[PDB]
Design an enzyme around this catalytic site. Structure first.
Site, PDB file in Angstrom:
ATOM      1  N   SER A 366       0.969  -1.108  -0.225  1.00  0.00           N
ATOM      2  CA  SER A 366       0.066  -0.049   0.125  1.00  0.00           C
ATOM      3  C   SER A 366       0.832   1.355   0.187  1.00  0.00           C
ATOM      4  O   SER A 366       1.949   1.114   0.731  1.00  0.00           O
ATOM      5  N   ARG A 367       0.511   2.081  -0.649  1.00  0.00           N
ATOM      6  CA  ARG A 367       1.612   3.250  -1.038  1.00  0.00           C
ATOM      7  C   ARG A 367       0.824   4.478  -0.429  1.00  0.00           C
ATOM      8  O   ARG A 367       1.429   5.491  -0.272  1.00  0.00           O
ATOM      9  N   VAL A 368      -0.391   4.283   0.401  1.00  0.00           N
ATOM     10  CA  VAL A 368      -0.884   5.220   1.291  1.00  0.00           C
ATOM     11  C   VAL A 368      -1.355   4.671   2.444  1.00  0.00           C
ATOM     12  O   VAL A 368      -0.992   5.271   3.396  1.00  0.00           O
ATOM     13  N   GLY A 369      -1.777   3.345   2.264  1.00  0.00           N
ATOM     14  CA  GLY A 369      -1.748   2.377   3.608  1.00  0.00           C
ATOM     15  C   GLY A 369      -2.385   3.030   4.691  1.00  0.00           C
ATOM     16  O   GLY A 369      -3.570   3.589   4.658  1.00  0.00           O
TER      17      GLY A 369
END
Lengths: 499, 470, 187, 83, 50, 170, 85, 113
Positions: A366-369
């Protein structure tokens, strides 16, 4: 009776071809009528043939405009008049589509009649700007324990779901929707995510299974299924996610939240390929159109968390890409991977190995996670990432004479993996996700026998539900785990664990 | 004759352009008949190229064609005859008998293209077929109205598998069947004709419980493409009009993809990915979507697929892989190991496999079997280098059970009386769940591995234990 | 400077001719003679069919041109240069195509519309007049360019009529309505 | 019928107008369609094979394909100045 | 029961070919002249309303 | 061949090599400018080869016993049957007789890649006596193949595997 | 170029017959080993469609290559089609 | 004033036919007034016959072959200055930071040597 049908035809009177431009087909082959006329014609305008076929006008060539038929070839024949609808592709948008299965044109294929849609808005509409977006801060809960903790999902956020073919890819998606019923029941339109499933290239029999399951789980009453089935024509299939996005825009624009699952963009790609090849426009890398990147990116950037001046709303999205036997390198996967912010990568070995649904969280990212995650769930789940990480490394040291440290890790890890198994089509609530994970975190499940992990889980939940429904209610309402609550929770966990 | 007279302009193989005159221009997908000393050449209209010059695809042979040859218009997609008496006729692509039982008795005629039925028409399947074949029953149960898919490469005797299916499911079933052969060998054709004359499925005296449509590979590519559509409409007549449940069977559908690829190239549509037609998806889609369980009839297709060089990642098998309900992969390797069925159990899954739906007990047993087998396959690598010494007692017991299970699956078939001699073992689903359960419980882990090999149910396994014993 | 671009394919020839003969203002003369030689060429079907046939060489084409300039004693030397051009370009098959297109450019320059009142049957002169009045009256054709209308008989239009001109059609063909009627009464 | 590089409308307009090239254009050319860093020029009929040509853009180019109706110069230089 | 339901559906298709027969009658009749004249004057009226 | 077959007599046609026929048709197609299929081999090569190959038959015995037998020969360039011409032929034929170059050098000359030598249709034509004797030849060899792989790791082999190994070697 | 062609008017055909036994022949059926002049028994046409399902009978006549592996492992009968690859 | 009518819109590759002696040059910037504000096309070819082929920067929807074009005469000129410090500007050189209109004194061509 016979009368109603005849009366319908009588209602169907009105004639005059008084239109500034008509067209006449010059030659029609391959569903690419090449029309002489239509001097005025908007780009990608909807045009209605003599045979009532609808088309778009991708190629405006200098002397002829090569209409692409959305309808069957058989009806069309050369020379035929091509009436100019005079409206660029637009689909009805509005609140009527809640609990409505609609095809691409909008026509209900569940036959729930004319949509209670309050506008027709264009298929492609430019994405929200810099200032029309505020940073994400509201999580969505899928009811899948691993996804919610290991891969936390925000709102207005797009994370990929890239994985192996028909491994219940659609199933992974469907589980999320089920948890959205619970939230849907709840008030505040942010909590009311009006899910949209975009069934692309999917046979009507398969979608029938979906429709019935959705009806069974009562999901139809916020669900929308934009359907471009296998049979539905390649223009319809191509424009199907774009069309779908517009429906989402109405909800989003009203400031509400919703979740749109584009499933699968891989078949959308193929449809674009079909269009390009038929229009003789050169196909890009790996014979998939070159500007497919531009199309997909445009689609995927119309999913966003809008700013508060833009009415605090969002369109969460979850595109699905079907891997070509686990090939994540390939022009369409590579492109999409670049566009998406997050990926979920399901692992086939795990499926066989009984983690069904199967997720491999090593290859999920996840790059926002955790930026949007339940605060409570953050507290009890940092450890879990690290424990599992160690478990992966000591997995291959599980083949004799083992060090105690490794063996301890192995025990904790195996129990966790069993705990994180998900029972398809049963979602969970965060107020019940956190206790289970808490137990594992406190290593109170280290002692619990592997066979009894499954038994433990449900039993613990019932034990908590009777004994400690104060705790459950506290977890639910506080949304944060107070030290006093964690104290009491630990006590409860110990007590249940003891039995 | 017809005012709609066209004159050939270019014979460029299958592509034959015709020059219909003024005020007359057949619609797309029509059928033209051209009088020839080769009977009627049938041309499927596939484009109009304007100036009343159409571009059509030939079905039949293109040798001995002379340009400017008058072309009558029969119009619309080739219309075969359908009727109650179609059962017990072998019918060529252009809808004419090829079993010389004289002209098929037409009740109705219908076009070979027919529109897919709408979402509304579809009725949600849930019926469970039971083939009496252990691998199918336990590890991937079939469903009536299904779209079973026999993925495999060549060599696995794909036709042989289907022949077993016809013997079991068809004979058992009351409804009619349609056996359609797309681009298959005349050796196979003759064998099939003989075999079903023998099995009486084709009973020449009286009617047959099946109709046949043999399209063979010598037939020109155009005909190879449009044989499938033809067969489907015969099934539709049964399904709809006669309100029957049909066991459709098609063979081999790679020939359908391949055929379409060739005529795409000929049509001038530049070859798409891995040389496959750009309209591959829509052609596949048209075939699958047409097949459904309507309220008038439930049709269970079984479609053979040839997976070139066992790469199912190749786009033609991969595209089909999505479109079919109940996949099975018959791996060459497993066949070579001597296990007949040649199904690779960890590579064979069906939509109908849902836990409670196939029985919670059945599911759990089968899950245990799968895990046991999956462990065994992984542990083979450990045994290979490290040896069997690094496997624990628990691991060793799982391996022993897997080795037994692996050959418990092996069972003979009626159609390998021919191949071998052993008469098939039709082992009911309920019996299989029990029999496999017993093994897992270890109740017959006191029975040798080779006494599981190539035999029936648990009772039989015990009997063969006695046979090895004395 | 064409009134409207009838892009290429003998319309590049027509365009070229149009501007060339427009600057010499000898378009009517050119058109008339071009029409005249074409009419008598068609009515000389010996090489009015073989004119079409592309057997002719450069040299054989050249000898065809020589026969052609006997057939019309001059009138616009730009169309005599057109003959040279067509023989040199080795295509004379689409010769009348250029003529028709040139006619459209010419009569567009004059300002003339040519429509049609396609119908099942040939129609009344009263009908012709009423439609002509209607068209001139309509703001759709407010004149500035004249009206010619050709009633044509096409049995293909099975009942009704369709008026066509300027990409504006009024189509009250009963055949189309019948098709939809048939379709809707299948239930 | 067919399309040829001498059926180009500007070329065609001179021929119909009975304009004689006069061998000026057998040693001078006028540039036609341009872009892709190659230009197709009309005339230059006395061109030597692999000559150096000077454009009015000032750019110089080497004739590569001497074709009957066009000569296709190759621009040794940027297309920005060329028109 | 199946054909009982079917006959109701089939009847509409039976009645459909009868429309076609009635079409052959209409186009034969001087409805072919008179109603085409009606279409003509109606079209004149439509085109006048532009 | 058909004159023999028609005459009711048995014959055999060796087609060496059809792969060069494909090159020829490739040349023809590319010089008749008809769209060239995969690997530039014509876009209707399968039809050419299939129509040619299915002519051979065991003629119906109401029409006599003359059988033309065919042996196609496709000399795989690299050994990779995913090549278009090899894929096409494989579908057409009743069986495939894969040969292995490494095994030729290894001394099994003639060299048969028995792992890939298959007959989809299967066997029923071969001497009844010879059928009886060679019954477990397949099993022994198949077991030998598995065993041989294990054996070359030099990992400890049980006697049962070495019975197989020894038997397999012979 | 510019040459005349006169249509032969005859579809492609070859001399066929058992007269070619023990002899090499080229495509146009002229012995290129030059074992006598053409000895044959009629002419036939190049393309002839395959025997049908009805014109087929089951293969049950072995034919053996004398290679034990070949005979044993792959079946060869009179009417068989086996691809040597 | 150099003007042209759009004569094709096959994809985002828009061919514009310009009137006599009003032919652009390769790399020039064209501005088509649109209900999308403006559409900026950059001339990347001359297709000859008083036609060019240009590429689009902005979207293609609603184009009608005929649309009047104005030719700026050269590569897009983007605002420059210390006024451009802290300005998000999209490609056409206009604020997407929405800190109101451009304050920059001078604008300068995008292509340079």
């Amino acid at each position: 009776e016979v009368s109603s049908i005849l009366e319908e035809r009588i209602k169907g009177v009105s004639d005059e071809a008084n239109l500034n431009e008509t067209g006449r087909v010059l030659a029609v082959g391959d569903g690419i009528a090449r029309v002489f006329g239509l001097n005025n014609i908007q780009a990608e305008e909807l045009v209605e043939f003599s045979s009532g076929v609808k088309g778009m006008a991708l190629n405006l060539e200098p002397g002829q405009v090569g209409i692409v038929l959305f309808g069957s070839d058989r009806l069309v024949k050369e020379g035929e008049l091509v009436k100019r609808t005079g409206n660029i592709v637009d689909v009805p948008v509005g609140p009527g589509l809640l609990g409505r299965v609609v095809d691409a044109l909008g026509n209900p294929i569940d036959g729930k009649g004319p949509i209670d849609a309050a506008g027709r808005s264009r298929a492609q509409v430019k994405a929200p700007g810099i200032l029309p977006r505020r940073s994400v801060h509201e999580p969505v809960q899928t009811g899948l324990k691993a996804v919610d903790a290991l891969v936390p999902i925000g709102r207005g956020q797009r994370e990929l779901i890239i994985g192996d073919r028909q491994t219940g890819k659609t199933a992974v998606a469907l589980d999320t929707i089920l948890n959205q019923k619970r939230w849907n029941n709840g008030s505040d339109e942010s909590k009311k995510l009006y899910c949209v499933y975009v069934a692309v290239g999917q046979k009507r029999s398969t979608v029938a299974q979906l429709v019935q399951t959705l009806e069974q789980h009562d999901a139809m009453k916020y669900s929308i299924i934009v359907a471009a089935t296998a049979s539905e024509a390649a223009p319809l299939q191509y424009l199907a996610p774009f069309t779908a996005a517009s429906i989402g825009e109405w909800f989003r624009d009203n400031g509400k939240h919703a979740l749109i699952v584009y499933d699968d963009l891989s078949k959308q790609a193929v449809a674009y390929r079909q269009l390009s090849l038929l229009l003789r426009r050169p196909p890009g890398r790996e014979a998939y159109p070159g500007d497919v990147f531009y199309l997909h990116s445009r689609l995927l950037e119309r999913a966003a968390k809008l700013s508060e001046k833009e009415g605090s709303g969002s369109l969460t999205a979850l595109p699905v890409i079907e891997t070509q036997g686990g090939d994540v390198s390939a022009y369409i996967p590579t492109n999409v991977i670049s566009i998406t912010d997050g990926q979920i990568f399901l692992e086939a070995e795990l499926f066989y190995k009984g983690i069904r649904p199967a997720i491999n969280v090593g290859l999920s990212v996840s790059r926002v996670g955790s930026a949007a995650q339940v605060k409570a769930l953050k507290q009890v789940a940092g450890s879990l990432k690290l424990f599992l990480a160690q478990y992966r490394e000591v997995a291959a040291f599980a083949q004799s004479d083992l060090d105690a440290s490794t063996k301890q890790t192995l025990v904790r890890g195996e129990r966790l993996t069993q705990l994180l198994k998900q029972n398809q089509y049963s979602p969970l609530a965060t107020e019940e996700q956190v206790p289970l994970i808490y137990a594992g975190v406190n290593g109170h499940l280290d002692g619990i026998e592997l066979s009894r992990i499954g038994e433990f889980e449900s039993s613990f939940l019932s034990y908590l539900k009777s004994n400690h429904n104060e705790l459950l209610t506290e977890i639910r309402e506080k949304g944060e785990l107070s030290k006093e609550l964690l104290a009491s929770l630990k006590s409860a966990t110990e007590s249940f664990v003891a039995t | 004759s017809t005012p709609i007279t066209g004159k050939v302009t270019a014979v460029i193989g299958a592509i034959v352009d015709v020059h219909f005159e003024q005020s007359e221009l057949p619609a797309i997908l029509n059928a033209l008949e051209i009088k020839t000393p080769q009977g009627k050449l049938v041309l499927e209209v596939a484009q109009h190229l304007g100036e009343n010059t159409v571009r059509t695809i030939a079905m039949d042979g293109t040798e001995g064609l002379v340009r400017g040859e008058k072309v009558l218009d029969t119009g619309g997609p080739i219309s075969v005859p359908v009727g109650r008496e179609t059962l017990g006729r072998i019918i060529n692509v252009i809808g004419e008998p090829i079993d010389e039982r004289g002209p098929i008795k037409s009740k109705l005629r219908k076009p070979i293209h027919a529109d897919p039925p709408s979402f509304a028409e579809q009725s949600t399947s849930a019926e469970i077929l039971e083939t009496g074949i252990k691998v199918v029953d336990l590890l991937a149960p079939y469903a009536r109205g299904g779209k079973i898919g026999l993925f495999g490469g060549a060599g696995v005797g794909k036709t042989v598998f289907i022949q077993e299916l016809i013997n079991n499911i068809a004979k058992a079933h009351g409804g009619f069947s349609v056996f359609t052969g797309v681009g298959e060998r005349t050796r196979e054709g003759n064998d099939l004709y003989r075999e079903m004359k023998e099995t009486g499925v084709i009973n020449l005296e009286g009617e047959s419980k099946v109709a046949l449509v043999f399209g063979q590979m010598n037939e020109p590519p155009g005909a190879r493409a449009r044989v499938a559509l033809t067969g489907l409409t015969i099934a539709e007549y049964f399904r709809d009009e006669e309100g029957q449940d049909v066991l459709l069977f098609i063979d081999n559908i790679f020939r359908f993809t391949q055929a379409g690829s060739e005529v795409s190239a000929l049509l001038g549509r530049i070859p798409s990915a891995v040389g496959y037609q750009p309209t591959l998806a829509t052609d596949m889609g048209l075939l699958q979507e047409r097949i459904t369980t309507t309220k008038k009839g439930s049709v269970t297709s079984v479609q053979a697929v040839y997976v070139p060089a066992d790469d199912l990642t190749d786009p033609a098998p991969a595209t089909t892989f999505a479109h079919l309900d109940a996949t099975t992969v018959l791996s060459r390797g497993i066949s070579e190991l001597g296990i007949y069925p040649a199904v690779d159990p960890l590579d064979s899954k069906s939509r109908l496999l849902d836990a409670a739906v196939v029985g919670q007990e059945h599911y759990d047993v089968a899950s245990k079997v799968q895990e046991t087998l999956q462990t065994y396959k992984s542990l083979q690598d450990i045994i290979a280098i490290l040896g069997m010494d690094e496997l624990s007692e628990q691991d060793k017991l799982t391996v022993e059970r897997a080795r037994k299970i692996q050959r418990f699956l092996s069972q003979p078939f009626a159609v390998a009386e021919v191949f071998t001699g052993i008469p098939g073992k039709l082992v009911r689903l309920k019996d299989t769940v029990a029999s496999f359960k017993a093994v897992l419980e270890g109740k017959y882990d006191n029975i040798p591995e080779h006494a599981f090999y190539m035999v029936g149910g648990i009772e039989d396994v015990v009997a063969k234990a006695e046979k090895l014993a004395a | 400077p064409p009134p409207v671009r009838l892009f290429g394919v003998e319309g590049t020839y027509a365009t070229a001719l149009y501007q060339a003969a427009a600057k010499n203002s000898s378009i009517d003369a050119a058109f008339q003679s071009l029409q005249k030689v074409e009419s008598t060429v068609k009515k000389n079907p010996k090489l009015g069919h073989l004119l079409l046939n592309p057997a002719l060489s450069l040299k054989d084409r050249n000898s065809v041109i020589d026969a052609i300039v006997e057939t019309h004693k001059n009138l616009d030397g730009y169309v005599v240069n057109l003959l040279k051009v067509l023989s040199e370009n080795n295509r004379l098959g689409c010769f009348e195509k250029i003529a028709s297109d040139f006619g459209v450019l010419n009569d567009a320059h004059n300002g003339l519309l040519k429509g049609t009142v396609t119908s099942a049957e040939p129609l009344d002169p009263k009908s012709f007049k009423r439609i002509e009045k209607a068209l001139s009256a309509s703001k759709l054709v407010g004149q500035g360019k004249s009206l010619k209308l050709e009633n044509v008989v096409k049995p293909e239009i099975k009942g009704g009529l369709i008026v066509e001109l300027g990409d504006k059609t009024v189509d009250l063909s009963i055949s189309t309505k019948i098709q939809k009627l048939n379709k809707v009464l299948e239930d | 019928t067919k399309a040829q590089p001498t059926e180009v409308s500007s070329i065609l307009e001179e021929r119909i107008k009975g304009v004689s090239d006069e061998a000026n254009l057998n040693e001078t050319g006028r540039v036609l369609a341009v872009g892709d860093g190659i230009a197709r020029v009309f005339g230059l009929n006395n061109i030597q094979a692999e000559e150096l040509v000077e454009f009015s853009s000032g750019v110089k180019g080497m004739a590569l394909n001497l074709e009957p109706g066009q000569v296709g110069i190759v621009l040794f230089g940027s297309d920005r100045l060329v028109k | 029961v199946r054909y009982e339901a079917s006959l109701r559906q089939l009847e509409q298709r039976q009645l459909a070919k009868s429309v076609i027969s009635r079409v052959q009658s209409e186009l034969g009749n001087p409805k072919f002249q008179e109603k085409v004249l009606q279409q003509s004057i109606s079209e004149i009226e439509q085109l006048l309303s532009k | 061949g058909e004159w023999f077959r028609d005459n009711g007599k048995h014959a055999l046609i060796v087609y060496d090599d059809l792969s060069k026929q494909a090159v020829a048709y490739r040349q023809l197609s590319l010089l008749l400018r008809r769209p060239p299929g995969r690997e530039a081999y014509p876009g209707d090569v399968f039809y050419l080869h299939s129509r040619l190959l299915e002519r051979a038959a065991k003629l119906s015995e109401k029409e006599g016993s003359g059988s033309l037998t065919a042996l196609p020969v496709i000399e795989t360039q690299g050994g990779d049957v995913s090549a278009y011409i090899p894929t096409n032929v494989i579908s057409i034929t009743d069986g495939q007789i894969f040969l292995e170059a490494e095994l030729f050098y290894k001394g099994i000359r003639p060299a048969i890649n028995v792992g890939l030598s298959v007959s989809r249709v299967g066997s029923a034509a071969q001497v009844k006596a010879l059928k009886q004797v060679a019954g477990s030849l397949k099993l022994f060899l198949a077991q030998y193949r598995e065993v041989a792989a294990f054996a070359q790791f030099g990992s400890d082999l049980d006697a049962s595997t070495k019975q197989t190994l020894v038997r397999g070697e012979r």
